[PDB]
Design a protein around this ligand. Structure first.
Ligand SMILES: Nc1ncnc2c1ncn2[C@@H]1O[C@H](COP(=O)(O)OP(=O)(O)OP(=O)(O)OP(=O)(O)OP(=O)(O)OC[C@H]2O[C@@H](n3cnc4c(N)ncnc43)[C@H](O)[C@@H]2O)[C@@H](O)[C@H]1O
Ligand SMILES: [Mg+2]
Ligand SMILES: [Zn+2]
Length: 216
């Protein structure tokens, strides 16, 4: 089960991925999460990536591809993996092709979670994340039972630094111009799957799960 999750900022990659990992147990590989973890530990990678992430810009291809290549080679990817937020440029897609060719783990499906750009600002500014487990909530669409705290572990929730109007706008701008070329790239390969992401979380996952049967 080799999967790629793609979608505009806030479309629900992390939300849907959390459901996939629970049902199948494949590693959830999010480049965004990897960069932020690096930013927290203040590693050289983290500091370099921060400049781009804080502005809502894409981190350069070379360094991004490098960390994904190493990640996909780990033992936990033996039965499959879930890429989240990578690739997000045709160049990264072409690089991944070579990487998976080397590992002998070609992509089964590229799942595009389609959501109108006009509703994503609301999805992100209203997002609140658990500082302990990283699961996401939304003040309106999926609120925690007790405001400010995680339903699972009681951890304090926060708002990601880049989820402000200005940066969200840049993120949408930067990723929107990369969207059609990526869709065309995978449509040509014959394994692009489009899912309507503008429905309730479990309804979206129902369609996502419909694509996962028979992948080992
Ligand atoms: N490959 C790469 N190359 C170069 N640079 C890279 C890179 N990868 C990462 N980067 C850098 O890292 C930065 C951050 O990357 P990243 O963390 O990947 O940013 P992102 O792509 O913008 O995605 P998000 O995490 O913000 O949203 P999501 O789709 O996972 O949504 P979620 O499930 O939380 O949902 C959002 C909200 O909506 C709610 N929600 C979810 N589903 C629904 C639903 N069905 N209905 C209503 N609300 C919902 C949630 O509760 C939540 O509040 C980038 O901007 C870039 O700078
Ligand atoms: Mg995410
Ligand atoms: Zn939590």
């Amino acid at each position: 089960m080799n999967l790629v999750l793609m979608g505009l900022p806030g479309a629900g990659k992390g939300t849907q991925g959390e459901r996939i990992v629970e049902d199948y147990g494949i590693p959830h590989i999010s480049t965004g999460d990897m960069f932020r973890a690096a930013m927290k530990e203040e590693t050289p990678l983290g500091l370099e990536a921060k400049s781009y992430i804080d502005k809502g810009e894409l981190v350069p291809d070379e360094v991004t591809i490098g960390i994904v290549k190493e990640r996909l080679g780990k033992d936990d990817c033996e039965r499959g993996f879930l890429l989240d937020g990578f690739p997000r440029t045709v160049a990264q897609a072409e690089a991944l092709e070579e990487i998976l060719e080397e590992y002998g783990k070609p992509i089964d499906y590229v799942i595009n979670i389609e959501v109108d750009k006009d509703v994503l600002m609301e999805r992100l500014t209203g997002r609140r994340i658990c500082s302990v487990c990283g699961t996401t909530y939304h003040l309106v669409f999926n609120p925690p039972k007790t405001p400010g705290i995680c339903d699972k572990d009681g951890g304090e929730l926060y708002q990601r630094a880049d989820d402000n109007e200005e940066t969200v706008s840049k993120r949408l701008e930067v990723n929107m111009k990369q969207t059609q070329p990526l869709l065309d790239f995978y449509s040509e390969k014959g394994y692009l799957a489009n899912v309507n992401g503008q429905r309730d979380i479990q309804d979206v996952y129902a369609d996502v799960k419909d694509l996962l049967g028979g992948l080992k």
